[PDB]
Design a protein around this ligand. Structure first.
Ligand SMILES: [Zn+2]
Lengths: 49, 49, 145, 218, 32, 65, 98, 97
């Protein structure tokens, strides 16, 4: 879970550096949010990892 | 009244009296309370710790 | 001093508390090293962050024995100390974007929903990038123009 | 047309149950709204965009050299160079905007195997970023067909990556275990891998349910 | 009464509501 | 053991202490407790050059102007 | 008491501006009557039929060009999303109750 | 030709009428715009931005929630809820509690 969170965060940093359009950047942000939720309480929302 | 207690909430009698006497000695209207009888199960669930 | 362990308090931690707890930011997703079973540098097991796996053993080996205490190695940043510190030293990850804590969003009732008077469905739409919320309006400018 | 057979009733029964997650990653609807509308671009416009992108990158290189080694030309010319770099950035942004629905249409084929539709879409988007970094006006291809390979290979790489966000439903584990046990028994006794017809015979389900459940296996 | 019947969801909602106000009346609302 | 101390600063305005041994030197820059780099008190162009001779790019830029 | 629209009723889904019309209401009412349950029980069947028709039209509109029923999984999840949006849709529920 | 005209004149004016009503929708959304309102229609949100972006601020994600919390005033809502509790009954009072 920590590895997944770090991966998403690093990729979000890269995307913000690359100047990608907001859609891709905030889709990666959504993925980061989901990764953090999985880290804290995996099964609480919907279907778990 | 003039206390910080939430209406409808359960309160330990000792805390209730302590805060009521504090506020009334400081000019506030003491909170109004109704004794409630509880089974040992619900009394256990209503613990403060 | 357990003789003054009188009460235990719990509360929300802020980002500054998390930064004060941590010894260093975890930068890389690395595990224990596949090549040699040593911890990766800046990984989740980094010794420079969480301390050395083996007592008083410098990462680069410039200090290796019991007589040395507390010294940071100038070449690799590991502290020459007892290994037990790996059970207590905390890390942190710096997020590029804010994230809401799942406990205070999910779980009925919704702490955030009740605080902001937002229906849980609407708050979920906002958080996971499915809807826009109006955050602030300059009411007087609109009123006069 | 109009039909309300028992299958449609069962489908709506399933849909109401699935609707219990609001911002489900399996739903692209919000993502489609966010894309908006941008027209499909012909070969000449795409090569124009690529030409602008490369020109802006070279302008960035020369401007970075001149920002350090002195030799700066007067501000009037520097302003035109400052315009070229911005033009290149805008061209890259537009060229990426033009193919998000292509990414979606390529991703829709991999759904149902464990990864959410939006995660596959993100992998395809990154494959598209890879594509724009290798596109060449010299080769003369349509950008859509060229970038399709990058999108699909990125999606496959993410799918074939050992570390993935496989998020299988809770209400499918038991039937998947039963499928595994029955397939194992049929393999051991039949002498060959069982065709979905035999599996459906044993599980008391329609064969297309066998083909659907098998997609979650890995 | 036979021709019309009962609406299941409305009865369920009325039941849960009734439980909520009865818990309030009993003064043990925050425990239910 | 005989010892020494050094300090580092980061652009956010925070400062950090580092004890050392007496026989130790001092680095000029340091990854601090914060995680930032502090001071003692494949890119697109790589990809474009691979498929180009820069005279083509010089002509490409000359056309823009 | 099982009325029909006098004029079409705009539903106004957030993206596809759906409507429920005389044909859909008539056919859903016929299905509910055929179900044979009491009125307050066949109400559920009526709601289900109208929801299914509206949802299928809405997803066919959303999936214009790029999506078809052969994409069974994507189609079913899109249908689930649209059904979820409809369930909490106040205007749709008020129209059905009318 | 008459039937073709009865299709043409009708649909051409109808699309323009729907657009004209969409403008009224935009204006009525602007005039009641307030914080914490969700806007789901991307067309409406984009038009609101293009027209009156300098008059408001919209966002999504946890950052928008953070900005909402920054703008939040605890005392005003607490006192409004207290006022509601001793005035309303039933589910309204219960939700206020
Ligand atoms: Zn060392």
């Amino acid at each position: 879970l920590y590895r997944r969170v770090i991966n998403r965060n690093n990729r979000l940093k890269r995307l913000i550096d690359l100047g990608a359009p907001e859609i891709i950047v905030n889709n990666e942000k959504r993925m980061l949010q989901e990764s953090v939720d999985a880290l804290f309480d995996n099964g609480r929302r919907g279907r778990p990892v | 009244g003039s206390t910080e207690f939430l209406p409808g909430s359960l309160t330990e009698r000792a805390e209730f009296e302590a805060e009521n006497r504090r506020v009334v000695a400081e000019g506030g209207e003491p909170a109004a309370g109704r004794p409630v009888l509880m089974g040992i199960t619900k009394a256990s669930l209503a613990t403060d710790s | 001093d357990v003789n003054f362990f009188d009460e235990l308090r719990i509360g929300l931690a802020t980002a500054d508390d998390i930064r004060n707890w941590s010894y260093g930011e975890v930068k890389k997703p690395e595990t224990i090293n596949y090549r040699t079973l040593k911890p990766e540098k800046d990984g989740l097991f980094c010794e420079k962050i969480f301390g050395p796996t083996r007592d008083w053993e410098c990462y680069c080996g410039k200090y290796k024995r019991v007589r040395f205490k507390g010294i940071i190695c100038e070449r690799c940043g590991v502290e020459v100390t007892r290994a037990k510190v790996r059970r207590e030293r905390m890390g942190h990850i710096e997020l590029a974007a804010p994230v809401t804590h799942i406990w205070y969003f999910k779980g009925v009732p919704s702490r955030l929903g009740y605080l902001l008077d937002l229906a849980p469905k609407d708050l979920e739409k906002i958080i996971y990038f499915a809807a826009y919320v109006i955050t602030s309006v300059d009411d007087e400018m609109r009123h006069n123009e | 047309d109009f039909v309300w057979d028992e299958e449609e009733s069962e489908a709506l029964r399933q849909a109401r149950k699935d609707a219990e997650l609001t911002a489900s990653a399996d739903s692209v609807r919000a993502y489609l709204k966010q894309i908006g509308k941008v027209a499909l671009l012909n070969a000449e416009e795409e090569v124009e965009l690529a030409k602008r992108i490369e020109a802006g990158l070279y302008a960035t290189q020369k401007l970075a050299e001149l920002a350090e080694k002195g030799e700066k030309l007067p501000v009037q010319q520097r302003r035109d160079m400052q315009w070229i770099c911005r033009d290149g950035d805008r061209a890259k942004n537009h060229l990426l905007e033009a193919n998000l629905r292509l990414v979606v249409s390529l991703a829709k084929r991999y759904t149902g195997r464990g990864m959410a539709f939006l995660d596959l879409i993100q992998e395809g988007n990154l494959g598209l970023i890879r594509a724009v970094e290798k596109f060449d006006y010299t080769k003369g291809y349509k950008f859509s067909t060229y970038a399709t390979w990058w999108i699909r290979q990125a999606i496959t790489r993410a799918m074939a990556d050992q570390a993935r966000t496989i998020r299988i439903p809770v209400h499918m584990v038991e039937v998947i275990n039963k499928l595994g046990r029955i397939q194992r028994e049929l393999l051991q006794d039949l002498g060959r891998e069982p065709t979905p017809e035999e599996l459906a015979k044993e599980m008391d389900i329609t064969p297309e349910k066998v083909l659907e459940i098998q997609q979650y296996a890995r | 009464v036979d021709l019309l019947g009962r609406n299941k969801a409305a009865d369920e909602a009325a039941e849960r509501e009734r439980r909520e106000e009865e818990a309030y009346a009993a003064g043990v609302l925050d425990l239910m | 053991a005989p010892r020494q101390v050094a300090r580092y600063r980061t652009d956010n305005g925070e400062e950090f202490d580092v004890p050392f041994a007496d026989d130790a030197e001092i680095p000029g820059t340091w990854l601090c407790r914060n995680g930032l780099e502090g001071t003692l008190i494949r890119t697109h162009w790589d990809m474009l050059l691979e498929r180009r001779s820069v005279e083509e790019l010089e002509e490409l830029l000359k056309e823009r102007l | 008491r099982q009325e029909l629209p006098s004029e079409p009723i705009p539903i106004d889904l957030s993206d596809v501006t759906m409507r429920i019309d005389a044909e859909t209401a008539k056919w859903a009412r016929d299905e509910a009557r055929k179900t044979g349950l009491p009125h307050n029980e066949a109400r559920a069947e009526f709601v289900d039929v109208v929801t299914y028709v509206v949802t299928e039209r809405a997803v066919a509109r959303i999936g214009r060009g790029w999506l078809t029923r052969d994409d069974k999984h994507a189609w079913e999840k899109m249908r689930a999303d649209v059904v979820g949006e409809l369930e909490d849709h106040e205007q749709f529920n008020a129209a059905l109750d009318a | 030709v008459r039937d073709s005209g009865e299709r043409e004149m009708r649909q051409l004016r109808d699309r323009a009428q729907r657009e004209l009503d969409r403008l009224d929708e935009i204006w009525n959304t602007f005039t009641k715009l307030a914080p914490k309102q969700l806007i789901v229609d991307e067309v409406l949100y984009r038009e609101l931005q293009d027209r009156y972006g300098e008059y408001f601020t919209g966002a999504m994600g946890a950052e928008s929630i953070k900005k909402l919390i920054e703008n939040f005033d605890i005392d005003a809502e607490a006192e409004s809820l207290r006022e509601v509790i001793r005035s309303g009954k039933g589910q309204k009072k219960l939700r206020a509690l």
